[model samples]
Target chain A: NSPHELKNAAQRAADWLVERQRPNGALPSRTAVIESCYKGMWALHTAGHTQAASAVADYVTSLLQPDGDIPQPREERYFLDVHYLYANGYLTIGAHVLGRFGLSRKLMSFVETMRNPATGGFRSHGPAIPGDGRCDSVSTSISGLAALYTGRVDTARSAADFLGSLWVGQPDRKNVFHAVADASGAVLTSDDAVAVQVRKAEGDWYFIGLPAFFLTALYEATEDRAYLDLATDLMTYMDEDCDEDAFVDSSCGKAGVAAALLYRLTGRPRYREIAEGIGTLLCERQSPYGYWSEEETGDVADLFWGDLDMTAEYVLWLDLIGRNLASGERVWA
Target chain B: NSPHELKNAAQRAADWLVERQRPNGALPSRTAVIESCYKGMWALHTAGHTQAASAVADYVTSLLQPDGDIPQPREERYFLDVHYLYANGYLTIGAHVLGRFGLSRKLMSFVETMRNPATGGFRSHGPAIPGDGRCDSVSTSISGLAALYTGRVDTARSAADFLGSLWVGQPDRKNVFHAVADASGAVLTSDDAVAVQVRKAEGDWYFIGLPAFFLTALYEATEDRAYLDLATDLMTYMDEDCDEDAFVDSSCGKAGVAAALLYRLTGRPRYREIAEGIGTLLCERQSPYGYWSEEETGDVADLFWGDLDMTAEYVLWLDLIGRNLASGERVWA
Candidate 1:
């Protein structure tokens, strides 16, 4: 799938993803799943035309049940897992890529109710009993909202409502939110969380997904510009986010991408200026293939992710946002 | 072949080269025969080793007839024509690569005799009735002799005899040599026969090969303290011999390699010090693939020479003389 031209390389990667689509039409990689569906959407939008996207659009339409939940495979036969979060994201992105942006709104509508007002964030689902209801809930919810934004779902007022509820304003959470939600889903609680203060129990780059999803989603919704401001304040704590420190967790790459994107979206020159320096530092820290070490949970087989996919995401964010901040001018090649 | 340890993109590129190697040892080509052969040698060298190089080795050896004449191939094989000289260079590199120092000596013997003793410099070859004895011819001959010295040919007196004859010491010639050689095989020809007043042809870096080859060969063969002093004097002309004032021709990758090797042999801090600067320039000039480009010639074909058989010769020279350059030693990654 490697190509001499970047355009072809990206096209080929998208084609490979498309070929893996299951009978139900959504990509069905259960284990070893990657969140490249956004990239897939980009490819479809750029390269795919009426016929190809229409075919996939029909497939996505079929996956949307009357209850609004899209069925995707998971560990337990009847049960779905965190990967459904990715599925929802893909469905949201896919709708826009297929020129069916309205379908994205439908998918986001279902995901919006899944947010946890208590944690000042969204949950993985409504409630998952004792386990699977921690920071991952926030992560899934953030990713879901991000998908809504990527699909350009402007009508989704629930985005603003969701952000408003996540404000606990406490020093323990640094006037920030927590990862987990309670039963009522209305009040912040003391549980496994990764907001202003990263949890010690979490593996490296794990909590990275939450902010990436949150900032991207916040940018997608095109509202509540506050997520970007909050991200900027955290940049002061940049030293804390380093993995090498082995003490306080760092933002790794996602936070950097989010910061850059936010600065680009808003006219705040400081956000863009600071991001330039941070981007350089982050790029220097990256392994040649891009991204930090694998920190995915569950099966060992699912832990693998290489540079191309990671590079595409990071590069796209940088190029797009960097260019935006540069006043829509193309940067030096 | 590309290894897993390589940077992801570089690894893929290396793997592609491995896959592209011709079956049964032929050059992989799509167009422009000479250019393909030229580029192919470069690929083989960078990839470190390739079985296909054996075919190129065979071709170069085949060109070396019983009478020691490498006839230019007919027009149908445009690649063969240019490579008649280049193949010998590559073969020189190839022989050195495998530790067959004898082959290097044999190639040098042919090159040394290419110069007509009756006149004083080299001719194009048996193919030319009088021969288009060009500056490149003289430079190529000098480079070949340098190879012999790198192989540690002990006949220092005879080697010095051959080198002394080529030194032009006249103001009319502007202390530089011409781009072409006379029928008498003399590079030291006076200004009367010379088209330009300059002793060296002021064009591409290829011209610098003559001075560098002589300087390095003298250092390697004589190891006399005066040889290095002469080398320093000769190095001044490189401003013209190289691409620009500072850009040494890419073919001079070996030249830099030779400079580096000389530094190691002498252990003179100045030799090592200057060699480092030259080595850095050479490294910087290298295209991402490690092949140096001749801007004026733009000959993208086979190893600068058409022959791949000399791989051992050039590789060995670069390995011996070029590899040990002390420039980058401080930053030993």
Candidate 2:
């Protein structure tokens, strides 16, 4: 019960991470090392456990390659991911806050390179020609937010325009929207094999919340109503058509944060109501272990990299939601 | 709104199926002709649309081979199924009620042949020897119900014995249980490739509701406390470990009936409360089109045969729930 309470939830995740530290004082990773430490580190720092945060920050700093790569990759689709985009964005801000200026700059620059100029969306993988790459909202939003914070205003603005186009590009605006698009801005109906698995795993929350989170942020930054409008439409799609049930985990957390931001911006009590309801779901599903379980949508990721990263990210959403509701600074802000 | 109401929901599906009848008075089947017509025909007959029911009954009679085959088969693994057991069970009762004795007897005899003396469970496919065939709860429950109704007391007892053995066979009684098993009564950890697809599509409902439904029926027929004991254990697993969310479709309905029956037997208000909650969900998710949309679980079946079979199945579940709550005969009873 203490673990589930909003007051203790973040601190509990921070506590869980500390106990998971290796004998060398590093956060543990199952193989195929991805970048979730920054979130855990920052969450710890925010919760006043600077010692554990420092250990994770130091460990993250060790993994940086000279050429802007996060080491210990997952198989075939590692380079072809939107996962790395948000991973880098979160780490960039976390590193900057931790005063690791050099590491932050490298992560920011890597994100900046991902923007595809032709369609104002980010590249699918690193190597595809900008006009030929597959682009989706998750990639664009992650890159967009990183660019906005790192002072890449053009990339940030373009990212907002890309999201607008994605909305306009759908054949049925009244129905559910699409995500993956070619650089030409056409929705790709048929995806590759890995993408089929990835899309099924990601489901609607990633589509709804990721884009809304970044678009809402961009709206605040650039005073762009189009970004705000598109963000509203995304949430409206959720309100109108998606599952009436709040998604049971970090997806709930992410969507709640987005709705909270919308409430703050539009002063809409309906959005606040949505956020409050989602918050209830978050509290309800929070495990006795302190971390939210991904078992609601089981085995979407392999067992190893699954919960640690999700817990870290959820703690950050907890912060974002707090910031929005209380008129406080967000985790990155 | 009227379509979603409990009073009109069954009528709506019956209306939907009537419009779907082919020019030849047969129900339309996309490529794979399966045995869903029995359910739809029976649903219509139950709903007071006897004219449309006769059309479907005629169509079903035309499909019966001399050796008890339903035609226009699905691919490779059609023979290796528990689907046929329930399909035949529902139709046997439906066909007999419509005065199609010849069709009904063929279906009942076919169901009897499926009972395996080796393990007191039903056979996997037609070809396998009794001791070599795969057996599962769905198959056994289905055959169990059919045999019980058809006056095969020994077979019915064997079927319930098989279910009792299944509960005892599980390695961990507290955890969610397994389904597919061998003739030797060991849980088959490895399933065939098609079984993998079928299991994923069926999800928890097929495991929990199907077995519990039959186990309760067996207990009622035989006055065996053990059968009721096993059924209660199944529902206990659901109450303790399953998602708190009521499954949004026929699963909820099926589970409600099982719980209602338990309430009737033991005078347990808890079971009544559980059934009432599920009844509310059945009302909530009912589409204005009058059927519960499988869209909540999306495309579990392909477009052609999808809703008709599910709509037919759901209406039957709706009827079953009503009967249990009212202390009346069930669909096959």
**CA lDDT, every prediction?**
0.39, 0.60
TM-scores for all candidates?
0.37, 0.45
Q: TM-score winner among the candidates? A: 2
**Span of 10 residues, lowest total lDDT, candidate 2 chain B:** B193-202
Query: What TM-score does prediction 2 earn?
Result: 0.45
Error in Å for residue B232 of model 2: 76
Clashing pairs in 2: none
lDDT tens digits, residues B1-333, model 1?
011111122222333343544532344343323333433333343333322333344344444565434454333332232223444444454433322233444555565554444543344433454335432333344444434423323332343333444444333434445544444444534443333323333433434344454555555444566556555554555434333433333344444544554554455555555445554553344345423334422333333232321222233333323224311232121
Which ranges in model 1 have alpha carbons more than 4 Å from their true place?
Answer: A1-333, B1-19, B24-47, B50-52, B61-68, B74-86, B99-113, B118-120, B129-162, B172-176, B179-202, B239-255, B266-322, B327-333
For model 2 the local lDDT of residue A148 reads: 53
